[PDB]
Every structure is written in C-alpha cells, then in structure tokens.
Nucleic acid binder design. Sequence first.
DNA 1: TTGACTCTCTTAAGAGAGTCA
DNA 2: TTGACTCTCTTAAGAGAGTCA
Lengths: 162, 162
Amino acid sequence: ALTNAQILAVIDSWEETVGQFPVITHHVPLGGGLQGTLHCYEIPLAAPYGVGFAKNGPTRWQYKRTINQVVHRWGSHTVPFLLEPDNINGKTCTASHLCHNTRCHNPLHLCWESLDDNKGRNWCPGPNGGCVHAVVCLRQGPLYGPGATVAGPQQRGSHFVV
Amino acid sequence: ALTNAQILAVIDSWEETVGQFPVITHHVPLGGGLQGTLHCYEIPLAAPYGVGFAKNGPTRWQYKRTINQVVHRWGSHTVPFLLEPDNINGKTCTASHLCHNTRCHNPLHLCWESLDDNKGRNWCPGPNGGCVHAVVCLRQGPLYGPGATVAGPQQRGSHFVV
DNA sequence: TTGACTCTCTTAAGAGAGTCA
DNA sequence: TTGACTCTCTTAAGAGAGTCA
Ligand SMILES: [Tl+]
Ligand SMILES: [Tl+]
Ligand SMILES: [Zn+2]
Ligand SMILES: [Zn+2]
Ligand SMILES: [Zn+2]
Ligand SMILES: [Zn+2]
C-alpha cells in the first residue's frame, strides 16, 4: 500500500505534468445571462499525452506510476482526490467536471462526488442563475434550458386524471 | 400496426387496460416549499399485469398486440406516442416520467423527448421552484438539492487558475 | 519503469427481441 | 392469440485491468 507521503508525491507529479498541458481559455455562460471565463488544462488529442498518461478510451485516460517495483494506475481525473474518502452515502465518488470539458484535467475544475450529483450538474442553471450545489458550479450546465420535448402529456379518452 | 386507424386502436386499447390499473395517490414536492398531488396508474408488481402487458425487466414492461395475424410489441410507456416522430435532432425520443414513478403508466404523467431531457428532469427544481421546461414538470426532481460532494476543487501547488 | 495500445465494466434514465406454454 | 418468462442493447456521465517491448 502506498503511504500518504507516496500518495502526496503522486499528486504532486500529476499536478506538475498536468500544469504543462495546453491551457485553453473558454468563455462560458454563468446563468442569469452572464458570461464568465474558464481556463482548462486540456490533455492532447493523441499520443504522447504527458508523462504517466495513456488513453484507455475515446475520452478516458489513466495515470500510472511505478513505486517500489509495483505499478499503480488510477483514472486520470481521480488523482487529485486520492487523499479523500472514495464513497459517500453508499455511493462511489467520481471525478466531476465543473467545466463540463472532458479533456480538461485542471484540478480547480473538478470535484469529487456521487455519479448522480456529477450528472445533475449538466442541467444546473449556474452560479449566477440559481445553482444550489453546496460545492458551487463554475458555469451553467450545457443541457440547462427549455428542452426539446416532442409531445407532452395527453390522452385520447377520459380514463385518466393527473 | 401500419395504418393510422390501427395505431389509434392500439392507443385506445392501451388506455382502457391502463385505466384499470390501481390509482395510487402520491404527494410530491413542487418546489418553492409547495406540495402537490399526483394520481399514478401503476402496473402491478407481479403477473398478471393486464391484457397485452408483460415484464421484460425489473422495471421494464412491453405492450403486445396481434394485428394482421402478426405480433407487434412496444415498450409499455411508448404507446401514447406512436403517432409522433420517434427522433428529434437525431436523438431517439424516449418516454419520460413526469411523476418519476417507473411503474406508473398514466399518459398524463408521460412526455416524449430525448434521453438527455428525460434524465435532466431528475434535477429540476420543479413547477413552483423555477422549472423552465417548455413541457412543464409536474414535480421537483427527486435528485434536486445541494448534493453531497466529498471534496471540492483544489490544488497542492501553484500551477493552476480557475 | 514506461508508453501506447487493447479489452470490459458501472449507473440509472431508457430500449429491442427470443423461448416456451 | 395471449401470457409469462428469458436475454442483451443504448446513452453519457463515469471506471478497472491486460499485453508487449
Ligand atoms: Tl459532469
Ligand atoms: Tl424520467
Ligand atoms: Zn476545465
Ligand atoms: Zn449547480
Ligand atoms: Zn405517475
Ligand atoms: Zn422542469
């Protein structure tokens, strides 16, 4: 098992490497009709990605470090949270992009929460539109809005009441 | 099946059978500290479920009818929408429970929308809490709230900015 | 020890189709 | 014809692990 010092060193080498990713400025909706700016540190689209990083899926990467001849590997966005509890309320903790930008590995753009909380940020009105998340959103969710419903509630007869 | 008249006959037969399901009253949060009341028509927990209905999964059912001697089968919640486009913006249309009650088959609790719109209703603040869905929600989403984030955005060094 | 690939799995909102009687 | 079971698949937010040099 890695000591807490070894984990800290893993987190430090991860931050060192990610800090050299290309930094892209994105203008984003905050809610309430406001505009804000996020700076994402984006993993490259193709190899090489950076020391310790490899792509295991179209938008999935892993970080790998070998310590005392033992290979350790983590999901690439989970590394900032290696000193945190890994579950809550019986649910696994997941890396959650506050910037909604999968390639971004900026730890200031990530939080550590259940998959349901993670997903729900897709529909949040944003920090200036009424977000109620205790760890506040950085932007309005990309899927927030009136939606595109094709057909609403309806019946042909009179068998039903709401 | 194929013709419009045949499709109307399927919707009417479905409504007649579901109109005989047990009607269960559920009191629900509306948002804004308000409460409302919904009447769900709930498919039975075990066989028999009703004429034409069979369970294909723990919370999945199908409706089956024999038309021109050929069996036609649909997901049990899709029948009200058989005359609607089955996609929108290149996304499949799905039956979306406004009451968030899978066993309910009340078509006044169903709409027809992309899977993303469907999912997002889980986190909607509700019709009295700021819902912006064009086809309005019937209740606050069961997952709306501050969340239970274990760790927020953080860095150990000074390589990152928001 | 390291890079660049390969594969399958989880979750919770949803689906389609076959085997018997 | 109808009922009651079986099985796997889709999506988009997320994961773990093997092989080879
Ligand atoms: Tl997310
Ligand atoms: Tl739903
Ligand atoms: Zn970012
Ligand atoms: Zn939020
Ligand atoms: Zn209902
Ligand atoms: Zn809504």
